[PDB]
Design a protein around this nucleic acid. Structure first.
Ligand SMILES: [Mg+2]
Ligand SMILES: [Mg+2]
Ligand SMILES: [Mg+2]
Ligand SMILES: [Mg+2]
Ligand SMILES: [Mg+2]
Ligand SMILES: [Mg+2]
Ligand SMILES: [Mg+2]
Ligand SMILES: [Mg+2]
Ligand SMILES: [Zn+2]
Lengths: 304, 71, 177, 120, 152, 173
RNA sequence: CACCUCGAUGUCGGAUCAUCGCGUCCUGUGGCUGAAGGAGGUCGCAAGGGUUGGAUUGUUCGUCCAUUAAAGUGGUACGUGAU
RNA sequence: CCGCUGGGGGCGAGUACGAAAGGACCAGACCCCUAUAAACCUCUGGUACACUUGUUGUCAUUUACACGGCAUAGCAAGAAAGCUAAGUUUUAAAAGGCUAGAUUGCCUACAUUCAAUAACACCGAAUGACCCCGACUUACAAAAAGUUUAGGACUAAAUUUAUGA
């Protein structure tokens, strides 16, 4: 799936001396890369973009609010999400944070990709992604991005890859109506119907809806609420559905759809949840459950 | 639902690409009897191998057991 | 069209379900009469699952188990073998009473072929592993099995010495009534 | 779920044993549900002043489909019934008959909370 | 311009030719495109062969000192199709400058070259720069000043 | 040149309870206890297993944690699906007012925090009105059992067309 | 008119599915208003997406049942039988 | 390059206006609905043909005890996973998707087995392996989780036939 790449004529007629000296004096005169960011808590600039998260769908459950209404709650789990790489405006063309999640053994990963983690000094992640971030949002390599990055009542934009269903016809892929079951219709109860329009168009359109293998598609659900965050167990409880099956990782970000630059007064820590007293925290061991926050909302039964 | 012209030798060859078989990159060879098969398959005398001399299995000692033969 | 492989369930084997259950009953009866049978991979995997179910039912040794096996297992020469030789042979084995070895393809239809045989018998093709593995009381596993509620589960003879002091008694025979 | 061209038993003494839904007032283009006002046509009369063949207004009080509530509970009725209404949003019937008149209703239908034998 | 000075020095084309630099200050895009087309085809050479693809490496600087006379900044359009139903896309000249300002001279030279399969190689050799400097500083490059504008 | 253990290796800390093999906190049933928590390890320190064999266990423990928390908040009688029930239910549509219901329960519909039951009452005036109730909803105050009617079937959906006279438990008006 | 196909080539219907134009029915809108704001008449821009029921006629013609913000008019071999 | 952001009724307002009946422009935001589009199975239901219960005829049944065959799964009732909608969420300026890709980084990468349609599984495993299968337990899962290397993904010794899998 690539064009024929390069004719690559080698002979430069001896102008190669000028280009080699120009390249040597171009790399050596480029600026030194900026220092390690070393982030502590920072101010909330209104036009500043935060990082995202790689969370794992764990299924759906039932909860009732204090007002007494059932809410469909999916539960996501943050699998040791850390910052693996970094891109910034001086050395790269853009300013981004590269995130990693999960874990894989050394024998289970390709040697070209394992070398990247061994150079970075981070464990071998199973998924690597990146998010565009502002200049003041560059968090250093090795920093965890857990459930505490998000707050209860926040609206997020979850991105997921849909369940695979295989090849289906236009009845359930495009939702087309077919022909009647019993009025003389011959062998065409699930036919797509007319596809072109005769000699004057003379062809089928480039965007025609025809049967195909739907499934595994990157669909984003926009502006979904966060109902509960368990910081100790890395659990976030979104309300509503998340695309994808259970066990597949999904992407999260602050909802840019609801963006007045105020972030709707959500209590978002800007660089990440910079943890104070990181000591006195147990490793995977005999730990217990912790406390969580939740939004309330007003008048779900204001009248009948 | 019907060819309008006759297919050329070049177009026929291009269309017949799905019909060709891929070569296998591994084979399990018995050093004695020279038999050839996959690494996950028995190809000794119990399966089809008229050339088997039993040297393919190099050790099989199991004398002791005790049970009730139902007769 | 219902999903059987990919959603753990029984194979369809190109047959209606009543034909499918009857064919499996015939094959499990043949598997215990001659202890190694050769068939296609799909029947071989289905036979392995069915053999585990039937052998455990014979291992119960109860009257209801005999009644259920009487319909499941056809021969009656081999209903005795399942309840006596097979039950005593695998009395302490936690499943896995059968192994599968692939044997190539068959001439009539190029279908993949597997050898399916009972393990732990004279005439098997790989040495079995012991069903139990007596624990060292001076190792980590034994202490984990003392702090947590696990039984000893040691290898045992058919009648251990814990019944010897009952059977030795001449006042516990009842003369045979 | 009460689709168009269905039938339902009007329970009050307004003079209609049965009616056919012929349209929905709101933008609800799928089905009608408990608490909704629809245009119904009386097919069979009780012999009294409301003769067969009139086109009046009715509110559905109960249905054979489950009526879901926010807490997670639902109410299931063994009959699909309705109560006729006037052009002032008031039932023309003196009282909703207890033969099929139990419902859950507090939104502005306080006039219907006195006609029914018991609510909830 | 850390890597843009590097990438423009990577050469795909043949390099037995001559480098040309043209200052596009005050030049009308059509007449400059005509002269650039004549230099790019290699027809300023006595040894010209229609089959052989010779030419010159044309470097143009000050691409934003280029003007469109008689209200062709708001009336001249750039139209193409996408292959999809309703795929007519027409961009004005002011919006074409606000999207990519070197594309005016680029399209003007593209419409004047011969329409064959040697056009890709000739359009490689046209390198149009918006500001007043180019990466080919130390190269031996011979200026092409146009003939004087005051015929009128 | 400079060998050193990193901040990632500072997760080699002593445990909180110094002698634990099973994790504790598990809301699973009585025997064969799980030997790992499905939330904390993240594959950093674990006897490894597939995900969706770990987030399904995670769903089970989270459901059980809420289920015993509600069970501690209020107890419920052990009852079958063929008995007359009286339900103390507060209505959230009204001002959280407790209204008593009475009917024969025709099902113990489900298991879990989503456990439910269906009480059927034929009102002698308005016929049968069967109501579905989530067992672990916060809007339930308590239930008691008074009338026993033994049936072989676990779902009594055949009472929907039986004798409506003998299904009278509540005629509040 | 008979220029094109009689080595015969689906139109005078709707069922499904379409694409485009605007001479806009609505939604978004500006001017004149005999302009009390409402409610209207034109006139100017704008084609993003919306235009539902069925009872009667073989009718694409048409009503009239009653709902909507509206129940648009056309190019589509008066779109669409190798569906 | 594609998709592309639909509306209606309230609240604003018994209102500025207007003798007076008669009632708005602003949608600017909140509450309800309804489409369209994209998902999901948490609820509610449907289905579920090697699941559970009851039963008729008949053939087998040295017991017309239990079990088995056939009669649409014989019939009827009730089910869990999975799928699904009539169910449940989300549909702003630009959002969102698809294909190509300057760069940058890395490289101990010949690609065999775990079931013949991996769509389970590459964001999985192959013995320092719970990947699959079996066994045991769970009515507070009418069954998908937990223990377990019993069987298959072979394999090695001079400190364990071997992970606290
Ligand atoms: Mg025919
Ligand atoms: Mg089929
Ligand atoms: Mg049958
Ligand atoms: Mg479910
Ligand atoms: Mg079942
Ligand atoms: Mg027979
Ligand atoms: Mg299907
Ligand atoms: Mg093994
Ligand atoms: Zn050999």
């Amino acid at each position: 799936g690539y064009q024929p790449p390069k004719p690559r004529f080698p002979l430069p007629d001896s102008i190669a001396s000028i280009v080699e000296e120009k390249t040597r004096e171009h790399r050596r005169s480029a600026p030194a890369p900026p220092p390690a960011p070393k982030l502590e808590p920072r101010p909330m600039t209104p036009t500043s973009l935060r990082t995202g998260c790689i969370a794992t769908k764990a299924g759906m459950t039932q909860e009732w609010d204090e007002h007494g209404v059932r809410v469909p709650l999916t539960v996501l789990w943050v699998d040791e999400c850390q910052v693996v790489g970094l891109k910034t405006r001086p050395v790269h063309g853009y300013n981004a944070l590269m995130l990693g999640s999960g874990y894989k053994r050394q024998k289970c990963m390709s040697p070209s990709e394992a070398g990247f983690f061994l150079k970075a000094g981070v464990p071998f992640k199973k998924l690597v992604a990146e998010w565009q971030v502002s200049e003041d949002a560059l968090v250093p390599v090795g920093t965890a991005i857990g459930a505490a990055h998000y707050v209860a009542g926040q609206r997020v934009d979850v991105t997921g890859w849909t369940k695979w269903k295989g090849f289906q016809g236009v009845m359930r892929r495009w939702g087309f109506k077919g022909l009647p079951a019993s009025h003389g219709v011959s062998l065409s109860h699930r036919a797509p119907g007319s596809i072109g329009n005769r000699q004057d168009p003379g062809k089928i359109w480039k965007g025609k809806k025809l049967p195909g293998c739907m499934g595994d598609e990157r669909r984003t659900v926009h502006n979904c609420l966060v109902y509960k965050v368990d910081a100790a167990r890395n659990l976030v409880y979104l309300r509503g559905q998340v695309p994808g099956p259970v066990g597949r990782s999904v992407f999260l970000r602050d909802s840019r759809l609801a963006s007045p630059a105020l972030r709707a007064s959500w209590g978002l820590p800007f660089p990440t949840h910079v943890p104070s007293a990181e000591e006195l925290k147990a490793a995977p061991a005999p730990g217990d459950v912790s406390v969580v926050p939740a939004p309330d909302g007003p008048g779900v039964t204001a009248w009948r | 639902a019907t060819p309008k012209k006759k297919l050329s030798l070049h177009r026929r060859g291009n269309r017949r690409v799905w019909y060709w078989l891929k070569r296998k990159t591994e084979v399990a060879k018995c050093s004695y009897c020279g038999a050839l098969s996959g690494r996950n398959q028995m190809f000794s005398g119990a399966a089809g191998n008229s050339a088997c001399t039993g040297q393919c299995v190099e050790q099989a000692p199991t004398p002791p057991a005790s049970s009730y033969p139902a007769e | 069209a219902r999903v059987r492989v990919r959603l753990g369930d029984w194979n369809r084997l190109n047959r209606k379900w009543q034909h499918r259950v009857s064919m499996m009953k015939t094959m499990v009866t043949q598997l215990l009469e001659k202890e190694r049978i050769r068939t296609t991979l799909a029947k071989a995997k289905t036979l392995q699952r069915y053999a585990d179910k039937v052998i455990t039912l014979g291992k119960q040794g109860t009257r209801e188990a005999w009644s259920e096996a009487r319909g499941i297992v056809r021969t009656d020469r081999e209903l005795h073998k399942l309840f006596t030789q097979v039950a005593l042979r695998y009395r302490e084995r936690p499943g896995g009473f059968t192994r599968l070895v692939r044997a190539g393809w068959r001439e009539r239809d190029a279908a993949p072929v597997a050898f399916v045989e009972l393990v732990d018998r004279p005439g098997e093709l790989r040495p079995a592993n012991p069903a139990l593995q007596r624990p060292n009381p001076l190792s980590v596993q034994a202490w984990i099995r003392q702090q947590l509620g696990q039984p000893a589960r040691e290898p045992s003879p058919l009648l251990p010495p814990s019944v010897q002091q009952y059977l030795r008694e001449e006042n516990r025979i009842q003369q045979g009534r | 779920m009460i689709p168009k061209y269905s039938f339902l038993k009007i329970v009050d003494n307004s003079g209609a044993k049965l009616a056919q839904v012929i349209g929905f007032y709101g933008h609800q283009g799928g089905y009608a549900s408990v608490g909704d006002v629809v245009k119904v046509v009386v097919k069979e009369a009780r012999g009294e002043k409301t003769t067969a063949g009139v086109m009046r207004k009715a509110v559905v009080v109960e249905q054979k489909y489950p009526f879901h509530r926010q807490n997670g509970s639902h109410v299931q009725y063994l009959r699909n019934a309705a109560v006729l209404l006037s052009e002032k949003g008031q039932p023309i019937g003196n009282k909703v008959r207890s033969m099929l008149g139990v419902e859950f209703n507090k939104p502005r239908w306080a006039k219907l909370k006195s006609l029914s034998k018991r609510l909830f | 311009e850390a890597i843009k000075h590097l990438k423009d020095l990577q050469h795909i084309k043949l390099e037995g030719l001559r480098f040309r630099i043209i200052d596009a200050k005050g030049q009308v895009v059509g007449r400059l495109a005509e002269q650039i087309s004549v230099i790019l085809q290699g027809k300023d050479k006595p040894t010209y062969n229609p089959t052989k693809e010779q030419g010159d490496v044309v470097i143009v600087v000050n691409a934003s000192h280029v003007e469109l006379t008689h209200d062709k900044w708001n009336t001249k359009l750039y139209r193409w199709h996408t292959g999809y139903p309703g795929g007519l896309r027409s961009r004005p000249a002011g919006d074409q400058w606000e999207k990519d300002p070197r594309m005016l001279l680029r399209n003007a030279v593209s419409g004047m070259l011969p329409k064959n399969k040697s056009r890709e190689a000739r359009m490689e050799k046209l390198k149009i720069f918006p500001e007043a400097d180019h990466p080919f500083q130390g190269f031996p490059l011979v200026p092409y000043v146009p003939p004087p504008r005051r015929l009128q | 040149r400079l060998s050193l253990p990193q901040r990632v290796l500072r997760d080699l800390r002593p445990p909180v309870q110094p002698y634990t093999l099973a994790p504790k906190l598990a809301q699973r049933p009585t025997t064969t206890p799980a030997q790992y928590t499905p939330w904390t390890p993240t594959r950093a320190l674990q006897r490894r297993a597939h995900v969706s064999r770990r987030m399904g266990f995670l769903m089970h423990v989270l459901e059980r944690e809420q289920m015993e928390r509600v069970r501690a908040a209020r107890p419920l009688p052990e009852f079958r699906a063929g008995d007359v029930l009286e339900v103390r239910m507060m209505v959230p549509e009204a001002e959280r007012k407790v209204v008593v219901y009475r009917g024969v329960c025709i099902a113990v519909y489900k298991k879990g925090i989503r456990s439910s039951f269906k009480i059927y009452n034929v009102f002698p005036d308005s016929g049968g009105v069967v109501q579905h109730i989530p067992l672990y909803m916060p809007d339930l105050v308590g239930v008691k059992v008074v009338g026993r009617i033994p049936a072989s079937q676990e779902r009594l959906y055949y009472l929907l067309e039986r004798e409506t006279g003998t299904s009278d438990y509540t005629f509040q008006t």
